[PDB]
Amino acid sequence: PFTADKGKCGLPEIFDPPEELERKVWELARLVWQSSSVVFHTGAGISTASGIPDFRGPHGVWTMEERGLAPKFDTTFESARPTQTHMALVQLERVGLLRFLVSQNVDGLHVRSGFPRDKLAELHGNMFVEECAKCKTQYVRDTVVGTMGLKATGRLCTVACRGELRDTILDWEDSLPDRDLALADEASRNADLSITLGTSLQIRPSGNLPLATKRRGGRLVIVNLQPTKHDRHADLRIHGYVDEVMTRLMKHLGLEIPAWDGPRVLERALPPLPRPPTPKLE
Ligand SMILES: Nc1ncnc2c1ncn2[C@@H]1O[C@H](COP(=O)(O)OP(=O)(O)OC[C@H]2O[C@H](O)[C@H](O)[C@@H]2O)[C@@H](O)[C@H]1O
Ligand SMILES: Oc1ccc2ccccc2c1-c1nc2ccccc2n2cccc12
Ligand SMILES: [Zn+2]
Numbered sequence: 001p002f003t004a005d006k007g008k009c010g011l012p013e014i015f016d017p018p019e020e021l022e023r024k025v026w027e028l029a030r031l032v033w034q035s036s037s038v039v040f041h042t043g044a045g046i047s048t049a050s051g052i053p054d055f056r057g058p059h060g061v062w063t064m065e066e067r068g069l070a071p072k073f074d075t076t077f078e079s080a081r082p083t084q085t086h087m088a089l090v091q092l093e094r095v096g097l098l099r100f101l102v103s104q105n106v107d108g109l110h111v112r113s114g115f116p117r118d119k120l121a122e123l124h125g126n127m128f129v130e131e132c133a134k135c136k137t138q139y140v141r142d143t144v145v146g147t148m149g150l151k152a153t154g155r156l157c158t159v160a161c162r163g164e165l166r167d168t169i170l171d172w173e174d175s176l177p178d179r180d181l182a183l184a185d186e187a188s189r190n191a192d193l194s195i196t197l198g199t200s201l202q203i204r205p206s207g208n209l210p211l212a213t214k215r216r217g218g219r220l221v222i223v224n225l226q227p228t229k230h231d232r233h234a235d236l237r238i239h240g241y242v243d244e245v246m247t248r249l250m251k252h253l254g255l256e257i258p259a260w261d262g263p264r265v266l267e268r269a270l271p272p273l274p275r276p277p278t279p280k281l282e
Helices: 018-034 061-066 084-094 178-190 206-214 242-253
Strands: 038-042 100-103 120-122 129-132 138-140 152-156 164-167 193-197 219-223 236-238
Touching: 018 193, 018 219, 018 236, 018 242, 038 084, 038 206, 084 242, 100 178, 120 178, 178 206, 193 206, 193 242, 206 219
Parallel strands: 038 100, 038 193, 100 120, 193 219, 219 236
Antiparallel strands: 129 138, 129 164, 152 164
């Protein structure tokens, strides 16, 4: 709990220089174009450009704690805006290029960005979500739910039930949600491309799921400023800021990154929108 293993923290950052970075994002476009089933895995580094520190970055929560310093937030969770990366994931799902979204983040931003909850697994919980112990109904709130560790929040279930409502923030000892894990695992297994964004992949089983894509010939892309636990298994590793990678990628793919209306919850994925025709890849 206090000696929970926080892994390797504050490893040096890598910057692919510009021409190498262009070449690798073109190759990622290539693989997106060639794949039948793309699953994206996200961690805390997709939210740093919205003011939320990561865990193991140079100024991450655990990194800073190791040296005696505090992490720094430049927003609240309620006032955080989804990044260019978050919104690029919203679009890729709408046009049928993303089959499933696995996230370790609890920051609420994927849900708030409008991303459909039935294509999303929130492996570590979501701080805006509470869950009824009795019927299992979830409530996506507009403010962070006061507690962590699957505790009672003090509110009751309003289903047509009075069950105790609890947070969904897993503690060190707490097993992952079975639904979310089972769907992330299925998705990961059947995917032919897994792309990891802003995770150092050190937590298991979250960080292992991208490797499942390797099983039957799947390709694995890792996008991260630091080294990650599975770098050697990656077919491509792109060392850059994820917003810069994603914006380049979308431009190659011929897609706009859509506008954020403010916080919205979408339960179920809408019907898929038209998307550009695919280039010839010789
Ligand atoms: N803007 C950026 N662009 C690219 N990479 C980034 C950026 N900012 C940060 N990174 C990289 O982002 C990576 C973020 O890695 P970690 O900080 O381990 O977060 P996790 O999501 O995998 O943490 C897993 C869980 O562990 C915790 O205990 C909680 O339970 C978490 O749910 C770093 O390697 C950064 O270099
Ligand atoms: O619990 C969350 C939840 C979400 C986050 C998002 C970004 C960065 C840190 C956190 C944290 C984190 N967790 C802590 C757990 C135990 C002790 C201190 C923690 N901590 C301090 C600041 C942020 C956090
Ligand atoms: Zn209930």
